[PDB]
Amino acid sequence: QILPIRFQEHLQLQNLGINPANIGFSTLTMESDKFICIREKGAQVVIIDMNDPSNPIRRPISADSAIMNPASKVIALKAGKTLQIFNIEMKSKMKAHTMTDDVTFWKWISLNTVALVTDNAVYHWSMEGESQPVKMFDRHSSLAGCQIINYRTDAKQKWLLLTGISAQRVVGAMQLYSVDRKVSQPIEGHAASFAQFKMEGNAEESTLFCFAVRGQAGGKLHIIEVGTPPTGNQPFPKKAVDVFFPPEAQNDFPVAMQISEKHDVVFLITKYGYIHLYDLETGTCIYMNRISGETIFVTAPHEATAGIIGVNRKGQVLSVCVEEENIIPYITNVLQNPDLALRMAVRNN
Amino acid sequence: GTRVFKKASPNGKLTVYLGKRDFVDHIDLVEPVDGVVLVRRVYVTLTCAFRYGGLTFRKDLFVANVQSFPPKPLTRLQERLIKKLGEHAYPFTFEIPPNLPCSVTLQACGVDYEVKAFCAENLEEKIHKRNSVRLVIRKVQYAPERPGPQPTAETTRQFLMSDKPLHLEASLDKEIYYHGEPISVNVHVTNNTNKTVKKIKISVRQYADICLFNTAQYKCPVAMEEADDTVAPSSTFCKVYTLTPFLAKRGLALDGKLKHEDTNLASSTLLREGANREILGIIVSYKVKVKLVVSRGGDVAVELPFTLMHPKPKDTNLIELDIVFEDFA
């Protein structure tokens, strides 16, 4: 019987000769579906080009972290407080900077900017020119002592979302910062994502903020609009739905979220390797399934299918996306929700 | 200086360049066949066939056609060579489906991969072995080493008139071996009988099944050691022996023509679960056999399956960054 998603295993990194010891959160990064970057220690980095994963380049490094640019052959490296950005094409050092404070988390948040998180603050740093990191906001006390696990922004970079976790059950602490209001709010959540979404009859896109959590009430997914509706817009009615977990999955919680704006669906991944799909508009659950027996510990947008791609602890590179020929009939017949099916068919084709 | 292999047609009109002749199969994908042809359209084709027999049976397994002139990203090699060669240089790229059999020859039949570049109006036209060029490339199989327990086998014999056991256990140091790699065999005997083990014989045997046209099963030893190590009545014996399977023999599967320096014993056929074990043409596998040669009694042996693979291809700055031609022959 037909499924509303297509799931694929693209490859297992060990088949490429990659050492399974090097396959985990701290030694393996994937900032986009274009590259996987692995630090292998007798130190070096293995850059896997996903268009051509057979011919990985290996370079010597002395960095404790390496994060490939989402799009181009540009790599950022750090060693303590020392940050450097390198052009692999032109083989040249682009930029360097020495932070006052240790950078405990960093990632590319677009094609040409790095977000830097310290104990203290969050910075954006352009890869271009000579510009220094620009402090975006001070960290809120409720992330104090958390493992920082992510950092998200909306498309305009007007809404910035820092996420940490701690063992206490694993509690999720987010800080949502408004760049125009210059104000932070604390949010209990485990995984989140922004999205653009234009309501029927509205002049302009809404900026949606979606976050999932497993807290005191159990599993919840929230979808809200951030900011004041544009002139010509109705506000987006807040949605709040449950995120189901098994009896076998008492210790599971959300670890990743990607949103397809092509189909307006939320992909959620759980620590135990379940995937869920939710309607972005209503939060209705479309699909759940265990797709991996290991934690998927890094995810990115999967650009070609507008899906989700990730890597699990055993080295499997997996993705999920909407199966566009099955999703409507699946919602009609299997979920028996013909109202949703017609709305999604019309909204997205 | 980077090597690049080249080959021209007889009339010196078309030359093909390739970075490599052997393309590694990494189970989820195969190295792409990334070439340049230095120039009617100009086409380049990749064919995989099983052949038996001169020839008396052939089955096509895969064909891919590229129009190379006139015109997924170019490899650094392609660009590098396009610039270093001219504007009469054009790229061609094949991706070989990973489920096709690897190159294999048994002496005769096999599976071969042929790259063919030619000049001609349509694809359906008279090819002249004069301004076309043909290259035999190989697909060779890699696989990574396996986590967890190694291979292990054991047997127990009771001889006529007795109920005392002769027990043999053996294991290998790995599940996955590469060409040229030694195999260590751990041998443990408990001899509670009144017979003596006179010697111990360890062999590596290849098994090759022909699955098309004229089916047949060959066996053939590729390493043999015997030791005059004896196991007395009521005594135990533990020893590690080392063997390496070596090409330096009819019925043997090779990855290559026996006449070429770079040919190896054939790699183990990786078989997907219910795959068509007929469009693979030849199925190759390997075992270690450990045999106790018993005095005044039948011998006692175990076998330990293993997999034989082609090996994988070989100041403040926090990172460090940094072309000769050869005949394909």
UniProtKB/Swiss-Prot annotation, chain A:
Region: WD40-like repeat 2; residue ranges are 63-102
**Region of interest (WD40-like repeat 4), ranges:** 145-188
Region feature (WD40-like repeat 6): 251-294
Phosphotyrosine modification sites are Y177
Highest rank taxon of the organism:
Eukaryota
Region (WD40-like repeat 3) location: 103-144
Per the record, residues carrying Phosphothreonine are T100
Task: List every stretch annotated WD40-like repeat 1.
Answer: 22-62
Which residue ranges are recorded for the region named WD40-like repeat 7?
A: 295-323
Please state where this protein is localized: Cytoplasmic vesicle membrane; Membrane, Coated pit; Melanosome; Cytoplasm, Cytoskeleton, Spindle
Phosphoserine modified-residue sites: S62
Q: Where are the stretches annotated Globular terminal domain?
A: 1-349
Signal peptide positions (record): none
- Chain positions covered by the region annotation WD40-like repeat 5: 189-250
Which comment does the entry carry about domains? The C-terminal third of the heavy chains forms the hub of the triskelion. This region contains the trimerization domain and the light-chain binding domain involved in the assembly of the clathrin lattice.
The job of this chain, per UniProt, is described as: Clathrin is the major protein of the polyhedral coat of coated pits and vesicles. Two different adapter protein complexes link the clathrin lattice either to the plasma membrane or to the trans-Golgi network. Acts as a component of the TACC3/ch-TOG/clathrin complex proposed to contribute to stabilization of kinetochore fibers of the mitotic spindle by acting as inter-microtubule bridge. The TACC3/ch-TOG/clathrin complex is required for the maintenance of kinetochore fiber tension. Plays a role in early autophagosome formation.
Q: Which family does it belong to?
A: Belongs to the clathrin heavy chain family.
What is the annotated quaternary arrangement, including any partners? Clathrin triskelions, composed of 3 heavy chains and 3 light chains, are the basic subunits of the clathrin coat. In the presence of light chains, hub assembly is influenced by both the pH and the concentration of calcium. Interacts with HIP1. Interacts with DENND1A, DENND1B and DENND1C. Interacts with OCRL. Interacts with ERBB2. Interacts with FKBP6. Interacts with CKAP5 and TACC3 forming the TACC3/ch-TOG/clathrin complex located at spindle inter-microtubules bridges; the complex implicates clathrin triskelions; TACC3 and CLTC are proposed to form a composite microtubule interaction surface.
Q: What is this protein called?
A: Clathrin heavy chain 1
Lineage of origin: Eukaryota, Metazoa, Chordata, Craniata, Vertebrata
Curated annotation (Swiss-Prot), chain B:
**Effect of substituting K126Q:** Impairs InsP6-binding and oligomerization
| Cited PROSITE patterns | ARRESTINS
Task: Region Interaction with CHRM2: list its residue ranges.
Answer: 40-68
Keyword field contains DNA repair? no
**Which InterPro entries would you find in this protein's record?**
Arrestin, Arrestin-like_C, Arrestin-like_N, Arrestin_C-like, Arrestin_CS, Arrestin_N, Ig_E-set
Question: Gene3D superfamilies recorded for this chain?
Answer: 2.60.40.640, 2.60.40.840
Which GO terms of type biological process are on file? clathrin-dependent endocytosis; desensitization of G protein-coupled receptor signaling pathway; G protein-coupled receptor internalization; negative regulation of Notch signaling pathway; positive regulation of ERK1 and ERK2 cascade; positive regulation of protein phosphorylation; positive regulation of receptor internalization; protein transport
Taken from the UniProt entry, a GO cellular component term is: cytosol
Tissue-wise, where is it found?
Answer: Beta-arrestin 1A is found in cortex, cerebellum, striatum, pineal gland, retina and heart. Beta-arrestin 1B is found in spleen, lung, pituitary and kidney.
Report residue spans for region: Interaction with SRC.
1-132
What happens to this protein after translation, modification-wise?
A: At the plasma membrane, is rapidly dephosphorylated, a process that is required for clathrin binding and ADRB2 endocytosis but not for ADRB2 binding and desensitization. Once internalized, is rephosphorylated.
Purpose of the protein: Functions in regulating agonist-mediated G-protein coupled receptor (GPCR) signaling by mediating both receptor desensitization and resensitization processes. During homologous desensitization, beta-arrestins bind to the GPRK-phosphorylated receptor and sterically preclude its coupling to the cognate G-protein; the binding appears to require additional receptor determinants exposed only in the active receptor conformation.
Record-stated family: Belongs to the arrestin family.
The protein's name in its UniProt record: Beta-arrestin-1
Q: What is the lineage of its organism?
A: Eukaryota, Metazoa, Chordata, Craniata, Vertebrata
State the gene name recorded for this protein: ARRB1
